[PDB]
Design a binder for this molecule. Structure first.
Ligand SMILES: CN(C)c1cccc2cccc(N(C)C)c12
Ligand SMILES: [Cl-]
Ligand SMILES: [Cl-]
Length: 330
């Protein structure tokens, strides 16, 4: 089998991407944030504290003839950005772009943190990291990809995120028309539950490529590109007027600037992020200071190849017996 669904930026800045997902019988369509950096499929629901729902579409398990409460099961998650959610668990039928898993764990939120409430466009998350990170207790549950993998034509999914435009998540096949050149595959460590790989280096604009190993995760659920302080300093040093701002929380630059591209290495291959992809607009409404899309990971403990990086590439999440990651230009 295969599945294919269109993913769309939630706003003008590509802060996140949402993909329609069908849950239950009859189908309830919710727009979920596909997150290769986590492993829980959780949704706003008829059980979510009413004060914490503000425009999201909710899953109502009582209206699904295939929903079954998973007895005694609870979940609770906290994300790197400080947001949080928790609740109980059902199993139900879940379909993405024509691909169906029966008995998928659907984590129904009883509580969400303020940032989730404040984002009316995201009805929940669909985690696509490794199931070892799933938070359901006392019996850990599998991700949608893990449950679907054996049925797929090929045990892979692909992320093809658009810049200010729609894109595609495919399951079970590689669309050879969706990229230029070849796909370069690179090793993955699953030891921390992430799609963790080692970039071979970077360049800033037309500058000399620096060969250096950068360990990081491919995370579609993180907006920005978080890299070591030395690398980020070298990038922003090329932007007239750019500075690290303690009050704003990262590197900012004059909105009148044209940004240089950023290249990262994948083996011997190179992925070029256009400079415009690094502009995240005014720091506050009407400001002429703009927020940078490349920021330091120093306060994280891991580098994060988030949407800024991933949207510049066609990305293969290869769930073969030994997982690997593939990147192609596009
Ligand atoms: C541009 N923008 C909205 C931002 C401005 C100031 C600080 C930010 C910190 C993290 C993430 C942001 N996003 C891009 C959503 C920030
Ligand atoms: Cl199917
Ligand atoms: Cl190299």
């Amino acid at each position: 089998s295969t599945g294919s669904a269109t993913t769309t930026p939630i706003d003008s800045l590509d802060d996140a991407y949402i993909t329609p997902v069908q849950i239950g019988t009859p189908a309830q369509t919710l727009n979920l944030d596909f997150d290769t950096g986590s492993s829980d499929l959780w949704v706003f629901s008829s059980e979510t504290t009413a004060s914490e729902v503000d425009g999201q579409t909710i899953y109502t398990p009582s209206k699904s003839t295939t929903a079954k409460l998973l007895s005694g099961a609870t979940w609770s998650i906290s994300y790197g950005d400080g947001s949080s959610s928790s609740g109980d668990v059902y199993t139900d039928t879940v379909s993405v772009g024509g691909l169906t898993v029966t008995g998928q764990a659907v984590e129904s939120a009883k509580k969400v943190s303020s940032s989730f409430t404040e984002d009316s466009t995201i009805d929940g998350l669909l985690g696509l990291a490794f199931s070892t990170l799933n938070t359901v207790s006392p019996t850990q549950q599998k991700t949608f990809f893990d449950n679907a993998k054996a049925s797929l034509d090929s045990p892979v999914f692909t992320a093809d995120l658009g810049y200010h435009a729609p894109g595609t998540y495919n399951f079970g096949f590689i669309d050879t028309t969706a990229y230029t050149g070849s796909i370069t595959y690179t090793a993955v460590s699953t030891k921390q539950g992430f799609w963790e790989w080692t970039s071979t280096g970077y360049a800033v604009g037309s500058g000399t490529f620096k060969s250096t190993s950068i360990d990081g995760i491919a995370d579609t659920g993180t907006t920005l590109l978080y890299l070591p302080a030395t690398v980020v300093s070298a990038y922003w040093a090329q932007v007239s007027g750019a500075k690290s701002s303690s009050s704003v929380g990262g590197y900012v630059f004059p909105c009148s600037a044209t940004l240089p591209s950023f290249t990262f290495g994948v083996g011997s291959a190179r992925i070029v992020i256009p400079g415009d992809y690094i502009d995240f607009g005014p720091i506050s409404t009407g400001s002429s200071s703009c927020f940078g899309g490349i920021q330091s990971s120093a306060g994280i403990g891991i580098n994060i190849f988030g949407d800024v990086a991933l949207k510049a590439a066609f990305v293969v999440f290869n769930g073969a017996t030994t997982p690997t990651l593939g990147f192609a230009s596009k």
